[PDB]
Design an enzyme around this catalytic site. Structure first.
Site, short mmCIF file in Angstrom:
data_model
loop_
_atom_site.label_atom_id
_atom_site.label_comp_id
_atom_site.label_asym_id
_atom_site.label_seq_id
_atom_site.Cartn_x
_atom_site.Cartn_y
_atom_site.Cartn_z
N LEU A 17 7.15 41.36 -24.22
CA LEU A 17 5.70 41.47 -24.33
C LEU A 17 4.97 40.40 -23.53
CD1 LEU A 17 5.41 42.25 -28.16
CD2 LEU A 17 5.25 43.91 -26.25
N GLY A 18 5.59 39.24 -23.36
CA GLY A 18 5.01 38.18 -22.53
C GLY A 18 5.90 36.96 -22.47
N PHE A 22 6.50 27.80 -22.38
CA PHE A 22 7.91 27.61 -22.76
C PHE A 22 8.40 28.55 -23.88
N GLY A 23 7.81 29.74 -23.93
CA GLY A 23 8.17 30.72 -24.94
C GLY A 23 8.11 32.14 -24.43
N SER A 24 8.62 33.05 -25.25
CA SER A 24 8.60 34.45 -24.96
C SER A 24 8.27 35.19 -26.25
CB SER A 24 9.98 34.89 -24.45
OG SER A 24 10.03 36.29 -24.32
N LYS A 44 8.57 35.85 -31.59
CA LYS A 44 8.39 34.76 -30.66
C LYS A 44 9.59 33.82 -30.72
CE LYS A 44 5.16 31.29 -28.90
NZ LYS A 44 3.88 30.54 -29.09
N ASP A 138 -6.24 26.44 -26.98
CA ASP A 138 -5.85 27.44 -25.98
C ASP A 138 -6.59 28.77 -26.15
OD1 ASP A 138 -4.28 28.28 -23.79
OD2 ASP A 138 -2.54 28.79 -25.05
#
Ligand code: DQX
EC number: 2.7.10.2
Length: 293
Positions: A17-18, A22-24, A44, A138
């Site tokens: 999904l993205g 430093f994450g997915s 996540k 953010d």
């Protein structure tokens, strides 16, 4: 028995999904029966699960678990790995995706009244976050999710910080990820983040919405134009600071109502104390919606 404890061997990868910060985030089916009838969830995880990153991620999980509001993505649970204790955050899957992508795709059918509904909802999520003394840091359309045509939610908390008991700001001493084109001047100069710098960022979100995510009008494109496309690396930050100090600002989006533009510009006050509150923004936006409706 405890539905917030997910066994990772039953999570079947469906699609990415993205990726970022430093994450997915992945779309998975939690399918213990192994018959493809299980629930679809968002997961996540960390790309690089160092001890420092794992400590920060577990705080992020605690932040999200503590939030229950119509316009904040729902925590469902966690995965733990044996041994090194890697962590995965399980969330509700919101099928229409990021507000950034959604608006980029459907700009023809999304009118100002609908944009203000989303705006109101974003304000309400942020006001609630503020009652817990959390600073998001953010806020951007890429981190806001669309559940359906009538509801959006704040969808990521990877940079979110908790205010100290005795202070109304949090200072980040050694930043990594910094979305500088959404940052308040005091965040650029002193790495100081507060409810008021979140309000500055909210002004940039409102800009994003009323530009309908037109690429040539994005905050990075416009600020780089104003400081000069020749500026590179740390010089971008230096010149951005000088620009903002001199009341250089993003322009009015083409076709933006005066009343909405005025709100944007008030959020972008150099004087931190003069920025509006999220409580008052929600009131004002709902009054404008009423006037239009
Ligand atoms: F901020 C984000 C939040 C999510 C996210 C968090 C929690 C729940 C989510 N549910 C659905 C979708 C989603 C995203 N796109 N789609 C489409 C899939 C194909 N059909 C149309 C909809 C669905 N994204 C979800 C995913 C991301 F990626 C980022 C952005 N960042 C990623 C890296 O971490 C920081 C945040």
């Amino acid at each position: 028995s405890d539905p917030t404890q997910f066994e990772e061997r039953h999570l079947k990868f469906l699609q990415q999904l993205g990726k970022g910060n430093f994450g997915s985030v992945e779309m998975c089916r939690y399918d213990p029966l192994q018959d493809n009838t299980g629930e679809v969830v968002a997961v996540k995880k960390l790309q690089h699960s160092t001890e420092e990153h794992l400590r920060d991620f577990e705080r992020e999980i605690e932040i999200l678990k503590s939030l229950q509001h119509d316009n904040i993505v729902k925590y469902k649970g966690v995965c733990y790995s044996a041994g090194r204790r890697n962590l995965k955050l399980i969330m509700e899957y919101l099928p229409y995706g990021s507000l950034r992508d959604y608006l980029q795709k459907h700009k023809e059918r999304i009118d100002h009244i609908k944009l203000l509904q989303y705006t109101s909802q974003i304000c309400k999520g942020m006001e609630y976050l503020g009652t817990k003394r959390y600073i998001h840091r953010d806020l951007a359309t890429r981190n806001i999710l669309v559940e359906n045509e009538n509801r959006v939610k704040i969808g990521d908390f990877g940079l979110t910080k908790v205010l100290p008991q005795d202070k109304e700001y949090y200072k980040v001493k050694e930043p990594g990820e910094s979305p500088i084109f959404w940052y308040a001047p005091e965040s650029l100069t002193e790495s100081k983040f507060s409810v008021a710098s979140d309000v500055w960022s909210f002004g940039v979100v409102l800009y994003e919405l009323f530009t309908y995510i037109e690429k040539s009008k994005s905050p990075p494109a416009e600020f780089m134009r104003m400081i000069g496309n020749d500026k590179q690396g740390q010089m971008i930050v230096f010149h951005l600071i000088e620009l903002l100090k001199n009341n250089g600002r993003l322009p009015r989006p083409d076709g933006c109502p005066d009343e909405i533009y005025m709100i944007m510009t008030e959020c972008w006050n150099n004087n931190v104390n003069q920025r509006p509150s999220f409580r008052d923004l929600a009131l004002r936006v709902d009054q404008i919606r009423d006037n239009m409706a």
